[PDB]
Design a binder for these strands. Structure first.
Length: 165
DNA sequence: CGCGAGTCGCG
């Protein structure tokens, strides 16, 4: 089971689909080394160095948080049904209303569409909001995605650059 | 007409 890393006053709360099998085993988000998450948020500008998975609690220091749509561990995101995703979206919303981050970043177009029941969503900022929290759809950092690191970083940086101050 | 919903190949 991977614990949520949330708090009030965060700039961004990163939300993945569900934990992979090693993250599930280690108790840290995006724990598998094949996963680009830590490198991407570092290069995108959210952290000053590439944090190791086990340093995850320190994301709060950079006013960043991490959660997931579906708790149930699974090897591939596609093993998660639309029903679970939709159920997750409902709970995610409560978490957002609770902590009220400046932005919620959903990692995966399909994940966003399923969890929020949206059609033909485009990458980037959405018009949809949760109170004062704006919503973005960023490429999932999995090594299974064919989206390159360069593309991953750019997508994430665009988000960083938009949250001023 | 409209809508809602039923894998493959790509590094």
């Amino acid at each position: 089971m991977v614990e949520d890393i949330l708090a009030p006053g965060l700039r961004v709360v990163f939300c993945g689909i569900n934990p992979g099998l090693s993250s599930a085993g280690t108790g840290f988000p995006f724990a598998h080394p094949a996963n680009r998450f830590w490198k991407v948020i570092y290069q995108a500008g959210f952290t000053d160095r590439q944090l190791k998975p086990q340093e995850a609690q320190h994301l709060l220091d950079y006013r960043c948080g991490v959660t997931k749509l579906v708790d149930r561990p699974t090897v591939q995101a596609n093993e998660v049904s639309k029903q679970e995703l939709h159920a997750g979206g409902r709970k995610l919303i409560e978490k957002i209303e609770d902590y009220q981050p400046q932005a919620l970043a959903i990692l995966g177009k399909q994940a966003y569409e399923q969890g929020f029941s949206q059609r033909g969503a485009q990458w980037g900022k959405q018009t949809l909001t949760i109170g004062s929290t704006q919503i973005w759809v960023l490429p999932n950092p999995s090594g299974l995605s064919r989206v390159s690191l360069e593309k991953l970083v750019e997508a994430y940086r665009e988000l960083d650059q938009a949250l001023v101050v």
